[PDB]
Amino acid sequence: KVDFWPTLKDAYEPLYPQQLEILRQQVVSEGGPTATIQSRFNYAWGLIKSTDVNDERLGVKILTDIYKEAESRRRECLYYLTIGCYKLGEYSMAKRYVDTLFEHERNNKQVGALKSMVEDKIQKETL
């Protein structure tokens, strides 16, 4: 019975390389750069969900491409990008994004959770 918004912990457990590959194979077939937003994301997610820095970097890149392309999906993307940047440790960027996401849906419990959790890492590396 899984949510509209993925938990940050969710973003931390990877996929079995089999599963990550499946997602790719699927994006391959939809046609890399012509593939559906969904299947392209769902691969990006898996990438960010992975624990290889390079995989993640694609994950963000994938997501930022999605963000560029689908105005509807932009609102959502800021959130994954925010996860993505945090996971990747480009924290400021994540504050940037999450702050944007924050205006649109301010009251969202997770948007809050994420903003808040992005911020700690901001101060704690200001120590």
Partner: protein, 132 residues
């Protein structure tokens, strides 16, 4: 710096300031989708020995169908979303067209002035060549 190159590709600015104001989520899409992706052991499920007689595995099969049925519905409106996304692109683009087509008229008449405004000085050139 290699960490800075990548900061550079994936940068985005005016966009952030124009994010458009039940909705099935991108993430939800991803969730319902990975189970069904593990059909990879064998979006159409199995159907053959549908006729044989357990009450319980008959239902555990009914499950597979209904959680596939939820996935198709999920996959359906995600596609259906993509439709509206490119439907708005057609609008934004189509109006970018006539705005720009308005500019031909803008400079079609503004060229019409100079061609006429030229004409008068083509003309008083004849008139002054009614004299040395």
């Amino acid at each position: 710096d290699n960490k800075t190159c990548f900061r550079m590709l994936t940068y985005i600015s005016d966009d952030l300031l124009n994010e458009i104001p039940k909705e099935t989520s991108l993430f939800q899409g991803f969730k319902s989708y990975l189970p069904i992706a593990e059909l990879a052991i064998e979006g159409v499920e199995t159907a053959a020995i549908s006729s044989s007689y357990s009450p319980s595995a008959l239902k555990s099969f009914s499950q597979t169908l209904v959680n596939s049925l939820e996935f198709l519905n999920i996959q359906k409106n995600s596609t259906l979303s993509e439709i509206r996304d490119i439907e708005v692109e057609v609008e934004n683009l189509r109006q970018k067209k006539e705005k720009l087509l308005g500019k031909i008229a803008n400079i079609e008449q503004n060229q019409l002035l100079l061609e006429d405004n030229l004409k008068q000085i083509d003309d008083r050139l004849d008139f002054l060549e009614e004299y040395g």
